[PDB]
Design a protein around this nucleic acid. Structure first.
Ligand code: CL
Ligand code: CL
Ligand code: CL
Ligand code: CL
Ligand code: CL
Ligand code: CL
Ligand code: CL
Ligand code: K
Ligand code: MG
Ligand code: MG
Ligand code: MG
Ligand code: MG
Ligand code: MG
Ligand code: MG
Ligand code: MG
Ligand code: MG
Ligand code: MG
Ligand code: MG
Ligand code: MG
Ligand code: MG
Ligand code: MG
Ligand code: MG
Ligand code: MG
Ligand code: MG
Ligand code: MG
Ligand code: MG
Ligand code: MG
Ligand code: MG
Ligand code: MG
Ligand code: MG
Ligand code: MG
Ligand code: NA
Ligand code: NA
Ligand code: NA
Ligand code: NA
Ligand code: NA
Ligand code: NA
Ligand code: NA
Ligand code: NA
Ligand code: NA
Ligand code: NA
Ligand code: NA
Ligand code: NA
Ligand code: NA
Ligand code: NA
Ligand code: NA
Ligand code: NA
Ligand code: NA
Ligand code: SR
Ligand code: SR
Ligand code: SR
Ligand code: SR
Ligand code: SR
Ligand code: SR
Ligand code: SR
Ligand code: SR
Ligand code: SR
Ligand code: SR
Ligand code: SR
Ligand code: SR
Ligand code: SR
Ligand code: SR
Ligand code: SR
Ligand code: SR
Ligand code: SR
Ligand code: SR
Ligand code: SR
Ligand code: SR
Ligand code: SR
Ligand code: SR
Ligand code: SR
Ligand code: SR
Ligand code: SR
Ligand code: SR
Lengths: 132, 172, 160, 142, 337
RNA sequence: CGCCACACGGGGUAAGAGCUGAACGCAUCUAAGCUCGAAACCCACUUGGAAAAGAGACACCGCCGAGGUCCCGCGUACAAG
RNA sequence: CGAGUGGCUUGCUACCUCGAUGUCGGUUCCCUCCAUCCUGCCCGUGCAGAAGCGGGCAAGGGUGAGGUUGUUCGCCUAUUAAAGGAGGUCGUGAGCUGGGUUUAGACCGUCGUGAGACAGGUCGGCUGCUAUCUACUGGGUGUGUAGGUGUCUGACAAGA
RNA sequence: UGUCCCAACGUUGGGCCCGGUGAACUGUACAUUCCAGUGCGGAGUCUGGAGACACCCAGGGGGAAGCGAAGACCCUAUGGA
RNA sequence: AGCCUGUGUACCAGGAGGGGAACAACCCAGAGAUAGGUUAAGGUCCCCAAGUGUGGAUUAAGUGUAAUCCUCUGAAGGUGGUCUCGAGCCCUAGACAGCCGGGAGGUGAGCUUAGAAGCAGCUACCCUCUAAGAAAAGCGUAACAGCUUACCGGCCGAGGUU
């Protein structure tokens, strides 16, 4: 994919439960897979800021629950490093449900997003209120 | 068996060891004719290829040594020439000679230029959509022509649709 | 079952129907083919397929070869072509199989085969000097379905 | 570093195994032998199958080790060792009184041993120790 | 189903034993191109700090922007090219033929060598040039040593000696070039060889860690779950199958880890200067203060502070040179804290 | 869990694409010869390596003294050594 | 229908071992094979392209994470360039585990007059040893080459 | 929630070196082995090659079908309970 | 099956010594001690005693350098790889191949069909000019055209073909 523009220490793994930062009706998401990733023996697949991931809906509306969807990680608690050396970390781990074209399924994003993410998925960005 | 080849008056044939050199007004060509028990030599105004063996394998090479020698006679006088036409459908192909190699550009719209080095003292002349490869050494000349055509070989797609390339039009 | 199991003559002759029961029927549909109403002497050419090694040929193999040979002769000369071919051997040898370890191992009856000594004619065809090559092709296809190597020998035929 | 050889053999265009056999015979008889121009020694057959064999010897090995030589220098010296009981006193003595050289470090020229010569005009299927070494990856120091 | 998995550790850096010379020894040299010139230099590791640079990469989305970059400070005072050794080509590879020495020797070179009192530089030169006439001359190299004394943070005074090849134009020209340097007094500097922004290969003897087990030394797993409480925590499963009935040298075992020579490729030289601009407040931990010739290498360098590190023009650079990077800031903040 | 560094390019081939070419006047990529062509082979690069028994090379110093050991203060080293 | 190769399945034999060579599966760690799943290079196509499908060279590297089940196997899920198969005492208990199998306690179904039995099911149920030799990973002392210091060479060796 | 991803750093007692004390298991012999083969078909000792200068320290245990127990399984005995 | 179970015989068991790499029963050989000599099986380039023996031929695959065998594999099928032998027919009245030239008229045969003219199908398949030349063998065309085969002539010159 397009260079992120920052160094990321993946703070999530297959099975991690995270916040769904949008208004799709999904409240909590579970990580099932990470797009383009291939690990190594005994290694739990990891995902972090900027990665596109397959998710299953753990908490939310009946219609959304249990659905297997694609999403993009927009925030994480583990730090990331920007070109100038500073580390950046968020209050929580969150992702936004996205479709086959990477356009947000929802209509509004909740909470801040990382500039790095916004830049990779512009349509996701063109929905963000705050971009840190 | 023994075969004698009367050398042309335009030509001079000298040979030391297993190498033979032929010179004419069109240049010179040297070759190595080495095979078990086949002696090649210049006896006065004639070249001799002889052997005490006469089995299928020996006879085969004797016949081969001859054509090679007659081809050298021809090349040093009349010379050798292959004609080639450059054909392209959608993307204009730029064919040019640069240094000791012919360079082809925009083949099928490629950014990177395709190229091949010219063998021997072979000469390559292009005029419009026509190329003429010529020289005294049929080996070097023949290969150079072939290399140019090969240089536009495509394996990836259907050739019947994509035919762009430089093809040998006339074979000497 | 592989022919390696029965192609050799490594057992007594086992053919007595009076002491053997349950013998499977043969798969060979015909032994005399072509125009079997006409004599063999009525032909200028006589070509046989000769076996080069002594062996046993199971009926399933005689049928496959004969079939794959007459079939060709039919395809090249027609369902009524002026020719005639003969499979001169019949599968008299009964074969067993021990199908409990080596205890009371005598096998149950599973098939039949014909014993052919090297040099013998398995098949023999009679054709006109025209179809002489169509029969040589039928045999080529026949010896490809039986164990041993074979010689396609041309008996009456000095038209070459 | 100086080797008073009673005999100086010229391996140029000579069948390696045939020379090796005579050099071993002479070393056992007490002769100090120096084989010269090893890189030009010859071996008959398909270059392709000959090389496959020497490449296999190079690839063989394990912790204990199977150190096989790559230079015409050692290839030849090893060829001779396989014809000498190099683990016995008399055998090691013979082997150690034999040396092989790249080119010819002597002023005198070596002699060509009878029966070991190969006629290039009558043979095309043969390879040169030097050619084998280069294929094996040796540094063509000769 | 027994999933695949690469082996633990590389089999290309062994045997994993203690290095014979603490002074690194290059096993390769750059190719001959430009004018003749010494193909290497040396210095002593001091510590690290960071700098802020203006992006150089013309293919980078960030070209022309601030970028923080880690830097290892290496004190690189002048060295003395004390002699010229010539190698001749022989059937058994390259062998030293002779050397051309000088008269002016640093006051303490006698702490390592038996400095020459009676030498003849002309007979030697003669022999060398004769070898070139004959065409049996192999590469040309300079016997070089460092001047530890010029570095206060380093206790030693005994110079460290290494041979450095001289590459360049034609042999006749670089042979002359070599003799020039030597005869003077041999004194040369980091400038004479490298320019800020070029790529160098750095060689050094890594930090020693004495004996360490397979987990640390080879990166094998520790026993897991219940397997970690039975009496085995940091031991591998087995030393091999029933057959072959022997332990292969390829199985990860305990032993010496660290203090091995390593050659790190393509280290970008960020800046070559002199003074105390890179020095750190309070002093580099376990080293001292820098105030003199120095070199800022991008990233890390093998070895502990004070160890002798060697530079060489990169022999396999991946990228083109972008000389004299713009340094907008050099951290001097204390390294304690 | 952080940070840095980890080729391009040569050489010879396989399958394959061809050149010249005869046995077999022609034809033929093959029989002799040749041009190309794989992450594979060799080289490039890194690491070990004078116990390589052909047991190595060079320079200087020294044989009444060069160098070294013990001793002492210490670690860029270290289980003893 | 015919001819073979392997020794991965199963069967057969009873040649070795009953003064004992500790079962299956898993795990950990190492080497290998090719009948190639991916990756490189090719040929054909019912090859426009994109992509399929079939075939050739090729073992350098890779071939991963999860749900049921002791399972091997297999079924299933989301990823992936692909998530190949096989040998090493069905590699690996003087390395680990002890879930299955396979002692003594007990229950069920079936069988048996009964004691008791049943590759039928079920709950519980023990894992000894200070390494002599050899092998290998690292570290020393001597001898040999034959006064000392410093610098090298490079036969061979390892690498993905 | 360090069971795991994926391991790290630290604490105490050992381990290592020194003084003193001071056993046992085990031992047909020889024994520096490795790759193949052969052999009662599962060899450090046979055959062919390869490798191999001697001794010592620490180590984790691949092999000696390692040591420990005249196989508790299976069968046999004109055995026992 | 290095299996099971018979039979005859010699061997191992209980049999050395020589050979077979090693190897109970495959080969030589049955053996008191000691000594000289000659052979046996098997071998004679080196390891290792004896040939780098002679006349001749074949093989280019390192085939092979392996009597026997659990032990040494190699099959059905295929081969213009190469060597040797034989039979038929053609040929200096010029063969085989190649190259050059000619391949022509009635007449686009008749039928079928809107049309089909060598070449959809059906039937016939005849004669002029001539050194040859089909009522056309293979492509080709909507049908023609066009490209070749047969057939004749020339150049060339020695074996060719089955
Ligand atoms: Cl996954
Ligand atoms: Cl090895
Ligand atoms: Cl020996
Ligand atoms: Cl030859
Ligand atoms: Cl574990
Ligand atoms: Cl007797
Ligand atoms: Cl061979
Ligand atoms: K037992
Ligand atoms: Mg696992
Ligand atoms: Mg700090
Ligand atoms: Mg700080
Ligand atoms: Mg038994
Ligand atoms: Mg045991
Ligand atoms: Mg294959
Ligand atoms: Mg396609
Ligand atoms: Mg591999
Ligand atoms: Mg097992
Ligand atoms: Mg074990
Ligand atoms: Mg145990
Ligand atoms: Mg234990
Ligand atoms: Mg249970
Ligand atoms: Mg009870
Ligand atoms: Mg039971
Ligand atoms: Mg249970
Ligand atoms: Mg007992
Ligand atoms: Mg019992
Ligand atoms: Mg009783
Ligand atoms: Mg007995
Ligand atoms: Mg005698
Ligand atoms: Mg002898
Ligand atoms: Mg063979
Ligand atoms: Na040979
Ligand atoms: Na080797
Ligand atoms: Na324990
Ligand atoms: Na075991
Ligand atoms: Na290449
Ligand atoms: Na088989
Ligand atoms: Na591979
Ligand atoms: Na599963
Ligand atoms: Na076992
Ligand atoms: Na196991
Ligand atoms: Na256990
Ligand atoms: Na186990
Ligand atoms: Na812990
Ligand atoms: Na052990
Ligand atoms: Na007897
Ligand atoms: Na013997
Ligand atoms: Na062979
Ligand atoms: Sr039988
Ligand atoms: Sr057959
Ligand atoms: Sr001799
Ligand atoms: Sr396994
Ligand atoms: Sr150095
Ligand atoms: Sr080196
Ligand atoms: Sr335990
Ligand atoms: Sr073993
Ligand atoms: Sr080819
Ligand atoms: Sr030495
Ligand atoms: Sr036992
Ligand atoms: Sr293969
Ligand atoms: Sr592929
Ligand atoms: Sr199993
Ligand atoms: Sr199952
Ligand atoms: Sr079960
Ligand atoms: Sr049960
Ligand atoms: Sr249990
Ligand atoms: Sr000695
Ligand atoms: Sr031995
Ligand atoms: Sr221990
Ligand atoms: Sr001879
Ligand atoms: Sr002969
Ligand atoms: Sr066996
Ligand atoms: Sr056999
Ligand atoms: Sr065959």
């Amino acid at each position: 994919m397009e260079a992120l523009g920052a160094d990321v220490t993946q703070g999530l793994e297959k099975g991690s439960l995270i916040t769904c930062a949008d208004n799709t009706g999904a409240r909590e998401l579970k990580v099932i897979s990470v797009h383009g990733y291939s690990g190594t023996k005994n290694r739990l697949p990891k995902a972090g800021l900027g990665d596109k991931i397959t998710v299953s809906v753990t908490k939310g509306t009946p219609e959304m629950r249990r659905q297997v969807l694609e999403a993009v990680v927009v925030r994480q608690r583990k730090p990331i490093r920007r070109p100038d050396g500073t580390r950046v970390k968020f209050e929580d781990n969150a992702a936004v449900i996205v479709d086959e074209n990477e356009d947000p399924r929802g209509t509004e994003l909740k909470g801040p997003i990382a500039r790095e993410v916004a830049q990779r998925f512009g349509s996701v960005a063109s929905a963000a209120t705050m971009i840190v | 068996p023994r075969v004698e080849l009367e050398i042309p008056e335009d030509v001079d044939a000298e040979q030391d060891h297993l190498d033979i050199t032929v010179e004419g007004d069109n240049g010179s060509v040297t070759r190595r004719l080495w095979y078990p028990d086949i002696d090649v030599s210049v006896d006065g105004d004639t070249v001799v290829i002889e052997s005490d063996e006469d089995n299928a394998k020996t006879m085969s090479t004797i016949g081969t040594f001859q054509s090679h020698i007659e081809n050298m006679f021809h090349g040093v006088t009349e010379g050798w020439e292959y004609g080639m036409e450059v054909f392209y459908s959608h993307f204009p192909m730029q064919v040019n000679v640069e240094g000791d190699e012919v360079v082809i550009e925009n083949f099928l719209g490629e950014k990177a230029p395709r190229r091949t080095t010219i063998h021997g003292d072979t000469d390559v002349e292009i005029d419009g959509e026509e190329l003429t490869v010529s020289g005294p050494d049929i080996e070097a000349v023949g290969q150079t022509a072939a290399d140019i055509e090969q240089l536009t070989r495509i394996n990836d797609k259907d050739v019947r649709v994509f035919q762009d390339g430089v093809y040998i039009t006339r074979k000497p | 079952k592989p022919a390696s199991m029965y192609r050799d003559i490594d057992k007594p002759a086992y053919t007595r129907r009076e002491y053997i029961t349950g013998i499977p029927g043969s798969k060979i549909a015909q032994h005399k083919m072509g125009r079997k109403q006409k004599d063999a002497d009525d032909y200028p050419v006589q070509i046989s397929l000769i076996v080069e090694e002594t062996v046993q040929l199971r009926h399933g193999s005689l049928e496959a070869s004969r079939l794959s040979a007459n079939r060709h002769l039919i395809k090249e000369l027609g369902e009524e072509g002026d020719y005639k071919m003969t499979l001169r051997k019949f599968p008299h040898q009964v074969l067993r199989e021990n199908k409990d370890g080596m205890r009371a191992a005598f096998g149950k009856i599973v098939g039949t085969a014909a014993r052919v000594q090297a040099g013998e004619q398995l098949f023999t065809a009679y054709c006109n000097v025209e179809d002489a090559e169509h029969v040589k092709e039928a045999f080529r296809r026949a010896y490809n379905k039986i164990t041993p190597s074979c010689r396609i020998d041309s008996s009456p035929a000095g038209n070459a | 570093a100086e080797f008073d050889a009673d005999v100086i053999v010229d391996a140029r265009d000579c069948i390696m195994g045939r020379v090796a056999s005579q050099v071993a015979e002479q070393a056992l008889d007490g002769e100090t032998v120096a084989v010269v121009n090893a890189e030009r020694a010859v071996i008959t057959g398909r270059e392709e199958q000959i090389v496959e064999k020497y490449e296999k010897r190079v690839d063989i090995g394990n912790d204990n080790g199977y150190f096989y030589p790559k230079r015409p220098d050692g290839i030849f010296k090893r060829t001779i060792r396989g014809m000498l009981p190099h683990k016995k006193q008399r055998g090691r003595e013979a082997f150690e009184s034999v040396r092989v050289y790249l080119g010819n470090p002597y002023d005198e020229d070596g002699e060509v041993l009878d029966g070991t010569s190969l006629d290039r005009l009558s043979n095309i299927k043969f390879v040169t120790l030097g050619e084998i070494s280069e294929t094996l990856g040796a540094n063509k120091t000769w | 189903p027994q999933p695949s998995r690469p082996r633990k550790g590389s089999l290309g850096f062994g045997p994993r034993k203690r290095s014979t010379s603490e002074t690194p020894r290059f096993n390769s040299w750059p190719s001959d191109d430009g004018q003749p010139g010494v193909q290497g230099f040396a210095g002593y590791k001091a510590g690290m700090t960071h700098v802020v640079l203006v992006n150089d990469e013309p293919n980078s989305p960030r070209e022309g922007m601030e970028e923080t970059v880690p830097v290892t400070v290496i004190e690189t005072p002048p060295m003395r090219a004390v002699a010229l050794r010539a190698y001749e080509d022989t059937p058994y590879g390259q062998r030293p033929l002779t050397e051309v020495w000088t008269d002016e020797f640093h006051s303490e070179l006698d702490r390592t060598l038996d400095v020459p009192e009676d030498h003849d530089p002309d007979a030697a030169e003669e022999q060398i040039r004769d070898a070139h006439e004959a065409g049996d001359l192999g590469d040309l190299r300079l016997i070089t040593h460092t001047v530890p004394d010029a570095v206060p943070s380093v206790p030693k005074k005994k110079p460290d000696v290494m041979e450095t090849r001289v590459g360049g134009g034609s042999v006749s020209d670089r042979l002359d070039h070599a003799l020039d340097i030597v005869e003077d007094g041999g004194e040369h500097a980091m400038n004479d060889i490298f320019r800020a922004g070029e790529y160098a290969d750095v060689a050094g003897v890594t930090k020693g860690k004495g004996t360490q087990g397979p987990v640390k030394r080879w990166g094998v797993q520790k026993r897991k779950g219940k397997h970690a409480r039975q009496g085995w925590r940091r031991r591998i499963g087995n030393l091999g199958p029933w057959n072959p009935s022997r332990v292969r040298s390829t199985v990860p075992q305990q032993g010496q880890t660290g203090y091995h020579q390593r050659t790190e490729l393509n280290k970008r030289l960020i800046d070559i200067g002199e003074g105390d601009e890179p020095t750190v407040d309070g002093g580099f931990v376990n080293y001292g203060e820098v105030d003199g010739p120095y070199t800022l290498v991008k990233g890390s360098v093998p070895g502990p502070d004070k160890r002798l590190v060697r530079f060489r023009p990169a022999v396999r650079p991946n990228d083109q040179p972008r000389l004299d990077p713009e340094v907008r800031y050099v951290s001097n903040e204390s390294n304690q804290g």
